[PDB]
Design a protein around this ligand. Structure first.
Ligand SMILES: Cc1cc2nc3c(=O)[nH]c(=O)nc-3n(C[C@H](O)[C@H](O)[C@H](O)COP(=O)(O)O)c2cc1C
Ligand SMILES: Cc1cc2nc3c(=O)[nH]c(=O)nc-3n(C[C@H](O)[C@H](O)[C@H](O)COP(=O)(O)O)c2cc1C
Ligand SMILES: O=C(O)c1[nH]c(=O)[nH]c(=O)c1CCc1ccc2c(C(=O)O)cccc2c1
Ligand SMILES: O=C(O)c1[nH]c(=O)[nH]c(=O)c1CCc1ccc2c(C(=O)O)cccc2c1
Lengths: 313, 313
């Protein structure tokens, strides 16, 4: 009875890792994630230039989840790359590195210099497609031409196995089109579903006011709000992309939450809000909780139920 | 004090009504909603010919909300016209009629027959742009060309003010495009944000089975899961449609939930999931709580705080 996984030529103690942007921006953050009992870790998405991001407050949490418009605050590519090549203990766990370039050029430039270190040290790319292109156009993964572009281009400049962080979709036709595009690109070896449910609005009854300063309160949604949505996308893409892995992300608070993610076809399982709220010790609970579930049912490895969600007569 | 308001040349005892689909498919249902305290009611969306709809189980509720894939079961448009025509006590409360035709021809064929009754009896048309087509192509509302056709052809056919039931958007560039489309049509006098959040997926951990038979378990979400999504679209279209009303729908369980919807810009507040779960008694509670909030804050009218949520700096 174990949680072990092998994939993308790496061995993982458990399938629990953090969601990009949570406890992973600084060297302090990263050492703390590595000192944790997480299976993996992933660095805050990067741009070439360091960024402050939006004005505060810009993230808040509640009984049922969180809202954020951080605006991509990070220390710049050069730091995260240097953490990859010099500072990270791969013997502790594998590392993923997230890039969120604000144009296709910026993403190409970074991966080109990531390439050698990916090859030499084993760090794994999560390309963040749930990012903004030209303002007044939809975020990139909602714009399938821009999506095709980004993947052809990055593929060519990286030429190594990599994964993509996707936003939630809500129409079948979008599921259909998006997976087909992704299936064009053999180097895309995993798909991460899902990013924040975009542009929700949280209002405080007492003060009669939005809770985050940027975009007139509007922001990305996570936590218990987005779980079914996330199980939908995970299982959507699990079904439509049998040559890729899906990594689940969306409202994981509990072993049962992960158990359902895996049932839907999740290989790795990321924790965002719930981790921001409870902190890094969340990962020992999640492990134990899931293993109690597995015990109750007589499951001994994860593959014994991954993708094995039943449907009805 | 009382929650009276005037909209669209009608009087309402208070801004609450059911969400289309909930307690409104049979004559028995519509009599019940009429007997309730709702200030208004709306008919189940309908189609020219009756529909049996999808296999059961097709709807399920849980502590955080609901999932459904009913498949537009309905008694057919002739029944709902007859109800609007000869059966409804307009002295009690106004009636809206929802129409969710599978083509633009189907809709046109229904509105022309409805127009005389709307003139004669005052019934109101809520057009549902959340339906088939197809597959191979997105919902009408996520296809801004197909929406323009639907609005043109119905605007031309019906010729009296009506409103539209919109599905949620998640991208700013869609809010901008979406609303430009709706602003092209002076007859579109109100927008209902928002329909169920599309294609979520609830999995039961004990059975390890989806919970709704149709579509391998995939369906529309409502309830607490979607509240800040509904508040975002209410407000987003409140802001871009100064000459339209907005009717808020999505995740009202309390008076506080309504208060927020109103703050976002809502004129009418719709109740779907919570109504389906608690029954029509929920209208006396919702009224009481909302009124209790108002008194505590020193508000005498809905107009005093409609649309007035505060941003920060
Ligand atoms: C504060 C915060 C920062 C985030 N930063 C990033 C980021 O830099 N890159 C990214 O791809 N996703 C980012 N996300 C999205 C999360 O990775 C995840 O998709 C989302 O929060 C849903 O997960 P949850 O429901 O477990 O929170 C962020 C989320 C939050 C709350
Ligand atoms: C069982 C059920 C049936 C529904 N039927 C319809 C319908 O015929 N037409 C429609 O526009 N919306 C329909 N809806 C969507 C609701 O009117 C509403 O947009 C959604 O449930 C969100 O409101 P809630 O959060 O209060 O449930 C239905 C929802 C449910 C749960
Ligand atoms: O840093 C973020 O805002 C963020 N938050 C998330 O929940 N998921 C993410 O992928 C990101 C980074 C991508 C992102 C998102 C929003 C913006 C925005 C914004 O829409 O506020 C502005 C500038 C850059 C961004 C970059
Ligand atoms: O009757 C419904 O299933 C239904 N459920 C909702 O949550 N919102 C609605 O607007 C409706 C009626 C319109 C509708 C929506 C989706 C479908 C679907 C579907 O998207 O699976 C299939 C067949 C008919 C439908 C009719």
């Amino acid at each position: 009875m174990c949680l072990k996984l092998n994939l993308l030529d790496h061995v993982f103690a458990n399938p629990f890792m953090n969601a990009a942007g949570v406890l992973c921006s600084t060297e302090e953050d990263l050492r703390c994630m590595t000192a944790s009992s997480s299976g993996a870790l992933v660095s805050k998405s990067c741009t070439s230039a360091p960024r402050d991001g939006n004005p505060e407050p810009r993230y808040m949490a509640f009984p049922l989840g969180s809202i954020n418009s951080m605006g991509l605050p990070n220390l710049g590519f050069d730091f995260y790359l240097k953490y990859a090549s010099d500072l990270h203990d791969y013997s502790k766990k594998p590392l993923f590195l997230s890039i969120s370039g604000l144009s296709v050029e910026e993403n190409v430039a970074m991966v080109r210099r990531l390439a050698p270190v990916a090859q030499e040290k084993g760090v794994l790319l999560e390309l963040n497609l749930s990012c903004p292109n030209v303002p007044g156009k939809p975020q990139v993964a909602y714009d399938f031409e821009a999506m095709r572009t980004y993947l052809q281009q990055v593929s060519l400049a990286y030429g190594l196995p990599f994964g993509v962080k996707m936003p939630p979709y809500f129409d079948i036709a979008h599921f259909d089109t998006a997976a087909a595009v992704l299936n064009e690109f053999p180097l895309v070896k995993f798909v991460t579903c899902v990013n924040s449910v975009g542009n929700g609005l949280v209002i405080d009854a007492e003060s009669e006011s939005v809770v985050i300063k940027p975009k007139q309160g509007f922001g990305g949604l996570g936590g218990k709000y987005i779980l079914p949505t996330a199980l939908a996308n995970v299982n959507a893409f699990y079904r439509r992309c049998p040559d890729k892995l899906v990594f689940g992300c969306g409202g994981v608070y509990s072993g049962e939450d992960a158990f359902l993610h895996i049932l839907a076809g999740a290989s790795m399982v990321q924790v965002g809000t719930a981790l921001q709220e409870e902190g890094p010790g969340i990962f020992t609970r999640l492990e134990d909780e899931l293993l109690e579930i597995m015990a109750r049912k007589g499951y001994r490895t994860l593959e014994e139920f991954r993708g094995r969600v039943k449907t009805i007569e």
